[PDB]
Amino acid sequence: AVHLKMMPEFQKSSVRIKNPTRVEEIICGLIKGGAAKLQIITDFDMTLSRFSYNGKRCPTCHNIIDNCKLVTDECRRKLLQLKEQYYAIEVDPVLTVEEKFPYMVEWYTKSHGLLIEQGIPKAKLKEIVADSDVMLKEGYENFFGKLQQHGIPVFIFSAGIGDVLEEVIRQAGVYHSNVKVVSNFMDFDENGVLKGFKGELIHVFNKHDGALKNTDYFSQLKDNSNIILLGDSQGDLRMADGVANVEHILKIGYLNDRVDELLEKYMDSYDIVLVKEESLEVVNSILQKTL
Ligand SMILES: O=S(=O)(O)CCN1CCN(CCS(=O)(=O)O)CC1
Numbered sequence: 001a002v003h004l005k006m007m008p009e010f011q012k013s014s015v016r017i018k019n020p021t022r023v024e025e026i027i028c029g030l031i032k033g034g035a036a037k038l039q040i041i042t043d044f045d046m047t048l049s050r051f052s053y054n055g056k057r058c059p060t061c062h063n064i065i066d067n068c069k070l071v072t073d074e075c076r077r078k079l080l081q082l083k084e085q086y087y088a089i090e091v092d093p094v095l096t097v098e099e100k101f102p103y104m105v106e107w108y109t110k111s112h113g114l115l116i117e118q119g120i121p122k123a124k125l126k127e128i129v130a131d132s133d134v135m136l137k138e139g140y141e142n143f144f145g146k147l148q149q150h151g152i153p154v155f156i157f158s159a160g161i162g163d164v165l166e167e168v169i170r171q172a173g174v175y176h177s178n179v180k181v182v183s184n185f186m187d188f189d190e191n192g193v194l195k196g197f198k199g200e201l202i203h204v205f206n207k208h209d210g211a212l213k214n215t216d217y218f219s220q221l222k223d224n225s226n227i228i229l230l231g232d233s234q235g236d237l238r239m240a241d242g243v244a245n246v247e248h249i250l251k252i253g254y255l256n257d258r259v260d261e262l263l264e265k266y267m268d269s270y271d272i273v274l275v276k277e278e279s280l281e282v283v284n285s286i287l288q289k290t291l
């Protein structure tokens, strides 16, 4: 039987849970299925990576490029201005999520377009990532390590920049075979210089679309009917829409900011909400019982 009361990781004050009995029953199902039924579906930015260090916000994959030696101060000025106008739409309490779709498409297209003008070479990405301020959440080596040890599928589904994300995990030593990355990947010209992005855009609000356009992945994993989902946004709740069959799904949400405004809604939609939390110890504690 599962008792969150007896799990020290769940006693941390950042752990917020509306329905602990329900959560205990989901984790109970996860444990019963063991490795053979488990898969992970996860966002990256601010979910696997830290939201902040020392009251200095940490970079998203996109910020890593925004901030690198290859990008001019004037470019960052424009990027900032984009962010200020479009982020106000993102968080607008009056617009429906569907109304925000076109605005999100513009923001990501305009900001990608400014990066494309700056001339980013594939060969520089290693240096850029090494020099950046990126940080993975505390407990990431045990997270990725237990999962790879047991061959648990991990589907990292990111509205960031795929090439940057992959380079971060590769340098961390955690880009193992069990880890599949679906993101916005760079398109490179004859000289290995960024010229655009591949595929259809993934942004914060359309992850349902991408989840459905990955049937190949999920149909191979028909038996993995127990899911752990990790996200930092309401949008990440859709990352599991492509899953073949679902027996148990546990949804863990990082609430990194706009805490007072969003806490109720997060507690309502995620099973476990982690408030201003920079570790993976709750999820690692669940893996520990399960694997
Ligand atoms: O599922 S299997 O039977 O194949 C493996 C069993 N697995 C072994 C490790 N224990 C740790 C006990 S606990 O400390 O996590 O409770 C959890 C379950």
Ligand SMILES: [Mg+2]
Pocket (backbone or CB within 6 Å): 043, 044, 045, 046, 047, 232, 233
């Ligand atoms: Mg994110």
